Subunit: 251 residues, 4 copies
């Protein structure tokens, strides 16, 4: 019987690249989404076309609130409901926008979305994953290679990703006696929005040592797939940068 | 005019030592506290006896909630209303208890307290402090030298301290243009409670390379004093471990 | 035509596992060795029995000296001599013994062996590798140490050597990225405890590891190397992958 | 009796400022130097004019070689010879120049860059410990060690090694009451002779004040680490960089 994976924020971009890759490697997948309903269902469609009854979608807001623990438990429950098991959890969903310290979402909303999606939801999904448990159980957290050279005025976002590093380590340590490995993948710049000005994209592209290009979504997913594989059976609490050397470039 | 400082969680233990040492150095102080009202008032009394009109108290819960931004604004305000200025903020208050991943406060309450006290309140206090501004302005965040080798079952506490590192770096970068430095002090083991077990204290003491003892509250306060001083005027985004070598000791 | 890899200290243990997997993946290999001459020659024999003239041996002391630069150049040269190309370099060879700060090799000899093997020879091999250079996939993997920030008591020069190696991994990734050469590390925690260590002692270390209360196999370390040299790691450079079972996360 | 400090590479620039500050604090000082004899003697003279018999010079090359351990032992020995004790060691001496991967031989590059930045600090540390009250060592590291300058691999390997020495020695010497810490400068005291356009280019990158560190600012952190206010601090490295290491590309 095939193992099952939950991928948060999997309707598009990096998260969809990860979902697809697990599916192709033989996983059944829960495609989680928040707002992108049409993209999520469309992907579950493709993948079920490929193999019937191997994908489902699951809608959840991962903003922090008093019901977030229930929402995270229901995401995990939804994998068991659909597949009878849950082998892999990939915490990919993330809010990203500036929250300047000195001067519109209220600050309470900004805290809730940025810390919720990047850190607390990952923690709650990890609790639920562990609680509901031959096997290769693992969690992969999507981190950020630039957390120590942060974007100006992204304090909440940066605190959220730092918290996620802390979760990755704490969960690796705690869940090792249950056979559950917990690792991260830390993109540098990846998948630049089409919208973004072509000269702005080139400005950033030119900073990357390896090929003066951003990472493809495929390249990020490749590192996730490694960490979930039997090729990584002794790896836990590791975070693999996938950044083309960007984090090494001084100002 | 003497400079003024806010110290969170200043009624007892390390926060109290930081408040005393700053007051000794010539600062006027706001003693924030949550439950330790008699100790906070007694400290204020003792400090005002040394020097009239140099200490006030401010009570607030720093748990994450819809009212935390106003509470943090209140705390900074208390310093302006008493003293007419606010030069230094020390983010010392901190909830600390285990939050095991595998199963009595609800989990969402555990999240609110541990992430609120250790990260979100320090972010909101930082915003409020910055917004209100040859001065020597700075922020010192009490971090944790053991954050990369965390205690088992302390996930949320560790996440909170990692976020606080993230805040330290982000805010150092963003507030540098205003002349506000942001730094950290990372204690190892300091001031073990009297009522904790003798076997367990001996166990931990014996692990510290430098002297086989915990730090005194005054030794932690010494590093805070340095960072706020004119001897640290080029230092921002730095985190000083005060751990007797404990973090260097392998398992 | 098949790519080619140099693996230093490849006669035994982890280096041997790395050479074997690389060869199994389709690489031709230079098995570098220092003292383990029989092991190196019998390994090359086993590999060539599988595929003809896909393995050669190359002996060199990698202690720091006046002759180390030429030795390192000759290791890379031997790969070009045998196989016409050199696509991968794995810096695995390493001296490891204590050098207490406070009180019969002299200290200058300990410096030369520990800093030479762990840091200087990798630098020189990296220079020679790069100097000699869209289906190209060139890369270097340096064998680091997951416990570098919580070092063994009395192992200052070894630990200095491994820190220098992290520095090289970063500096060389930055500098060689324009040439298409990636530079990464694999950082074991405890792996393949020596056969002659008593099991009761092996178990004292084993017991510290969160993930299974055992040490890594040589093949588990090799698996990380294989990943880093693969096409699945094409945007990965300057990265160090811990393969430590969570050991570095465990407090005193 | 006043305590005594050894400061390597102390004839000029940042090492000189550290010596000056330790001397102002009440230390007797060994000013080690390699080539800057005139500056070193002039400094010793000035410090002894301020307080008699409180400074000496000591000449040594700290390039790696088979005699480096004896040279390091002799530096520590020179502090005991002059002052009867040795309380503080500051490993400041450092070679710094590019060594690209693609007149000096590479053997010589390795010897100077790895010797000065790492092996000499290790040997000096051994000699300091062996010869033994608030005893401590401060190693001058580099806040940019993880975002290094292009083509500076050996320099960078040296400073990484020095971080490892700081940790290993803090761990090992702690039972002897000897603390070991680091100060990691960002851009500091730019050469007067360096091009103004280039200086301005690097200055404008620094978040805190858009200026380099003064040598006195670096020294202030050294002074803290050797003081009685840092008696529980060992194995720590304090960046003194105005936030420069926080700035992405
Ligand atoms: N792109 C980069 O350059 C880069 C750099 C560093 C790190 N990373 C990391 O890699 C991961 C993926 O990057 P990306 O660019 O693909 O991400 P993205 O496009 O910014 O967002 C990924 C998904 O997160 C989900 N999400 C956002 N807010 C949410 C909420 N409140 N509740 C639930 N889900 C929410 C969204 O789902 P819906 O669309 O369904 O609403 C969105 O599709 C992230 O964790 C990111 O931080 C990316
Ligand atoms: N002690 C150590 O070994 C150690 C080690 C590493 C880091 N640290 C850090 O150093 C700092 C001082 O340590 P400590 O041992 O002195 O801390 P502590 O005694 O655990 O707590 C300090 C104060 O935090 C305040 N606090 C707790 N929950 C709060 C809430 N919901 N709202 C507002 N305030 C709250 C409390 O004030 P009230 O008493 O008034 O209720 C408490 O007295 C902390 O940031 C800690 O995390 C300490
Ligand atoms: N084993 C572990 O737990 C562990 C932990 C952390 C990191 N690592 C790293 O992983 C790598 C492999 O570990 P290992 O335990 O397999 O290594 P090892 O058995 O200690 O030695 C590897 C090889 O290094 C070669 N070597 C030693 N001194 C040399 C010299 N002076 N010149 C040239 N070559 C020399 C030896 O070759 P000959 O036998 O031919 O003389 C030896 O076979 C090393 O880089 C190590 O530091 C290992
Ligand atoms: N300046 C910066 O921006 C910066 C940045 C990061 C770190 N740092 C660190 O801070 C420390 C001081 O920096 P700096 O700019 O003052 O240093 P510097 O001017 O480059 O050199 C300091 C001294 O090192 C001594 N030295 C060099 N090679 C030597 C050798 N082979 N043997 C013995 N001594 C040798 C020289 O002595 P003589 O003059 O007597 O020959 C020189 O005066 C260094 O450790 C440096 O790495 C500085
Ligand atoms: N969830 C999430 N989304 C991100 N982005 C979504 C819009 C483009 C970037 C980033 C992102 C970025 C970026 C970026 C950096 C330089 C130039 C353009 C984009 C970093 N972490 C992120 N996390
Ligand atoms: N707010 C807060 N409080 C802490 N403590 C309050 C009770 C003593 C420890 C710690 C603490 C600790 C500890 C400790 C660790 C090992 C042995 C004994 C105490 C670490 N971070 C903390 N943060
Ligand atoms: N070249 C080299 N060799 C190592 N070893 C070779 C013999 C066993 C370990 C180690 C090693 C180790 C170890 C070890 C630690 C605890 C228990 C047993 C082995 C760490 N880095 C190493 N580098
Ligand atoms: N021993 C030593 N000396 C350095 N320098 C001596 C004169 C120029 C800088 C540096 C140095 C530098 C620099 C610098 C950075 C930006 C612009 C100009 C110089 C970094 N590490 C150093 N170590």
């Amino acid at each position: 019987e095939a193992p099952a994976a939950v991928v948060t924020g999997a309707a598009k971009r990096i998260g969809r690249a990860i979902a697809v890759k697990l599916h192709q490697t033989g996983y059944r997948v829960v495609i989680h989404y928040h707002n992108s309903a049409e993209a999520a269902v469309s992907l579950a469609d493709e993948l079920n076309k490929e193999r019937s009854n191997t994908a489902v979608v699951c809608q959840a807001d991962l903003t922090n609130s008093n019901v977030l623990p229930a929402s995270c438990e229901e995401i995990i429950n939804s994998c068991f409901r659909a597949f009878g098991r849950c082998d892999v959890l990939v915490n990919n969903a993330s809010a990203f926008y500036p929250t300047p310290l000195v001067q519109g979402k209220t600050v309470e909303t900004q805290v809730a979305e940025l810390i919720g999606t990047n850190a607390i939801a990952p923690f709650l999904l990890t609790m639920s994953f562990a609680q509901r448990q031959s096997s290769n159980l693992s969690i992969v957290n999507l981190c950020d290679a630039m957390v120590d050279q942060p974007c100006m005025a992204f304090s909440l976002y940066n605190m959220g990703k730092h918290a996620l590093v802390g979760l990755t380590q704490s969960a690796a340590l705690e869940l090792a006696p249950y056979g559950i490995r917990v690792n991260g993948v830390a993109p540098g710049v990846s998948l630049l929005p089409v919208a973004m000005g072509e000269e702005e994209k080139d400005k950033w592209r030119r900073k990357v040592p390896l090929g003066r290009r951003e990472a493809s979504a495929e390249q990020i997913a490749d590192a996730v797939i490694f960490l979930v594989s039997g090729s990584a059976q002794y790896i836990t609490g590791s975070i693999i940068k996938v950044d083309g050397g960007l984090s090494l470039v001084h100002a």
